[PDB]
Design a protein around this ligand. Structure first.
Ligand SMILES: NC(=O)c1ccc[n+]([C@@H]2O[C@H](COP(=O)([O-])OP(=O)(O)OC[C@H]3O[C@@H](n4cnc5c(N)ncnc54)[C@H](OP(=O)(O)O)[C@@H]3O)[C@@H](O)[C@H]2O)c1
Ligand SMILES: NC(=O)c1ccc[n+]([C@@H]2O[C@H](COP(=O)([O-])OP(=O)(O)OC[C@H]3O[C@@H](n4cnc5c(N)ncnc54)[C@H](OP(=O)(O)O)[C@@H]3O)[C@@H](O)[C@H]2O)c1
Lengths: 374, 374
């Protein structure tokens, strides 16, 4: 019978966040939304203590949580069991983009509204995917290692060092992030750009890439839709995952699909870790069939023993692994965007106007409100 | 009174090169030019033993060297002293691009011709410079470290993690590589692109970037020439070096010029290591004033104790250092290009037609033949 609770789970930044106000996505700085939440008579409970269910600080504040705020880089998994003891939950907001860590179906069954700050990090992840591509293709790991450990073995680096130019790049998903990856690839003079999704790209999108290809490289018709998944990964040197975890996309990048790729190919996954068969990825990196890079993991924070943390090609420890901890969507520039985004969503809710941006809505009124989840 | 000698100094790749025929830039594979050299009655002496002067295999074969072939990634320093005991030297060819390791003035005084495979690696280095930018700005080092050493400290990565978008990129040199860096930056939505050289860019080059800016980002007039060097580095978040080591460019990026940059700026140098004051770079990285990345060093191979091998920002060992061993110009795709390039230069010379590509000529007939050196 207390005040209504806003329960927010973010990662902790300690003294770093206390001295860097731009680290808004931290428990310390609370996205800057404390004044607003208290202006409207709500109790703001912010915590980084999100696991051991059901003993966490997060779990213990579920019974009076009206609004739940999470963040994908350090995500409180809002499962059916947890939704079942949050009886007055009305709204879930993701501080960022990516809401697979909710049980969206159980939330619909309760009429729960689910919002994201769609578009706050689309450019940031696209930069991360391009960086990953460049790091793997050009063998930055061994090139940096040679400089770090005092030697000068040019041939060890160059033996696995390829240009981006004249490679074939394929993307599973040409949405906001996927398409933005294609855009930044054009000036690298690819041999061909492939894409695979359930609907064909718009025309002016195909025309924009072809126009860019013509201006930069004098090449035309560089983009092409492949409709068979095995056919897409067979033709490509580099495949990026830029689609969502939507149930039948569970584990789609499995042992068989990896086997259909050329030996020495590259897999980038800044989308969702669970799109892959995680051990099949590790097997294929450690065998040298592929190199792998990305920042999303199947379980976050990732276990110490997670096989992706020690994957490498046979050539050496610094060959073929460009993993990072989940950071692309939470650069300082991105954090400013989605902190302001969470503030606008809460303002609309508190003022009881609910004039949300429609692209921000993931679930509402008991139904999905987007193709990005299901 | 033996046959005339072709003296070639390349790096060694051992069993790697013996099993990878694409490693043409190695002693093992000899650029594929042995048949041609012997077809014309020449003795091909290939060696990776290039230092201790005057005792090296390289030095000991100078007295009968007619053609000298070097490579910048592992360069035999053809100094005045060494030219003085190569009395029948006629031609020096660089297996790649970058000929600062010759004494070009002493070669002119002898009428020595000096050739490069201009353009063989322009795209490869531009990819390396962009990769370096992305690695430093986005804090890949700590992001990769966190994943490697079993932890999950999101805030440590994000505290120094910025987007490429809305940053100001400045290039010292808008030649083939510099301009190609600008081209690949456009789709990253920069705030502004600056450049600094002795002559203004052509018009259709300015128009190509502005056209690309308009198509991708809806922005116009994105390129701008700055004429004061301190003024260029004051305004920029990222400055790339893409000009040559031409005597008064010796040590230009010194303590003072670094001090004029904003704290937390970035310096990329895929050009020549000696463009910088090397210890001033180390001082400014270790103090955190800048981050630094690149693959060229003042002395190659770099000493074990070279300060750039252990530079890092105060935040940690994996902050602010993106050094690699000199590899960008020697990717497998690049090696195929400049091995064929060295073959054409030798064909023209052996057939005594000398129909060299004019862009390949660095010195000839006692004079410089390019603005890229002097
Ligand atoms: N690493 C990070 O920090 C970070 C940050 C934000 C987001 N993300 C991840 O990136 C993902 C999407 O990014 P976004 O916001 O750009 O998504 P988006 O804008 O919704 O675009 C997704 C695209 O993927 C396509 N797609 C959907 N299901 C597919 C399937 N099964 N196979 C192939 N293509 C499919 C969709 O087209 P059709 O509907 O026509 O198939 C759509 O065009 C999110 O799910 C999230 O997991 C990561
Ligand atoms: N890392 C690698 O593997 C690798 C491979 C190849 C080359 N490189 C390096 O990259 C350098 C050049 O690359 P490139 O082949 O693209 O050269 P380039 O085509 O000759 O272009 C050089 C540009 O720099 C400008 N410039 C010359 N001197 C300058 C100065 N003092 N200050 C500012 N700008 C100046 C020139 O314009 P103005 O004459 O109008 O000033 C010219 O436009 C080479 O010197 C080499 O050291 C590295």
């Amino acid at each position: 019978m207390g005040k209504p609770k806003v329960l927010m789970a973010l990662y902790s930044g300690g003294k770093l966040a206390k001295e860097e106000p731009r680290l808004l996505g931290t428990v310390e700085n609370e996205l800057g939304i404390r004044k607003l939440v208290e202006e409207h008579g709500y109790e703001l409970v912010t915590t980084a203590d999100k696991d051991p269910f059901p003993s966490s600080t997060f779990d213990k504040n579920l019974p009076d949580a009206e609004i739940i705020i999470t963040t994908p880089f350090f995500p409180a998994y809002v499962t059916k069991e947890r939704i079942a003891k949050a009886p007055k939950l009305k709204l879930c907001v993701t501080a960022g983009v990516g809401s697979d860590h909710y049980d969206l179906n159980a939330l619909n069954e309760r009429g729960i509204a689910v919002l994201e700050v769609t578009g706050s990090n689309v450019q940031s992840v696209a930069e991360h995917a391009i960086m990953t591509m460049l790091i793997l293709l050009r063998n930055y790991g061994e090139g940096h290692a040679q400089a770090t450990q005092g030697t000068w073995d040019i041939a060890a680096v160059a033996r696995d060092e390829f240009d981006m130019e004249d490679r074939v790049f394929a993307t599973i998903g040409a949405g906001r992030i996927g398409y933005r990856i294609l855009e930044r690839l054009i000036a690298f003079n690819p041999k061909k750009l492939l894409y695979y999704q359930r609907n064909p790209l718009p025309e002016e999108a195909i025309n924009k890439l072809n126009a860019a290809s013509k201006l930069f490289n004098g090449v035309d018709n560089i983009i092409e839709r492949v409709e068979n998944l095995e056919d897409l990964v067979s033709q490509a040197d580099v495949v990026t995952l830029n689609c969502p975890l939507y149930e039948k996309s569970k584990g789609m990048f499995n042992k068989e699909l990896i086997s259909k790729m050329k030996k020495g190919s590259y897999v980038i996954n800044t989308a969702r870790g669970a799109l892959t068969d995680p051990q099949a990825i590790a097997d294929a990196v450690n065998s040298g069939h592929i190199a792998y890079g990305g920042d999303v993991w199947p379980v976050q924070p990732a276990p110490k023993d997670m096989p992706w943390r020690t994957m490498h090609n046979p050539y050496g420890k610094d060959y073929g692994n460009a993993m990072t901890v989940h950071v692309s969507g939470t650069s300082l520039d991105a954090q400013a965007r989605y902190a302001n985004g969470v503030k606008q969503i809460l303002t609309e809710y508190f003022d009881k106007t609910y004039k949300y941006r429609p692209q921000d809505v993931i679930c509402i009124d008991g139904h999905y409100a987007t193709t990005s989840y299901g």
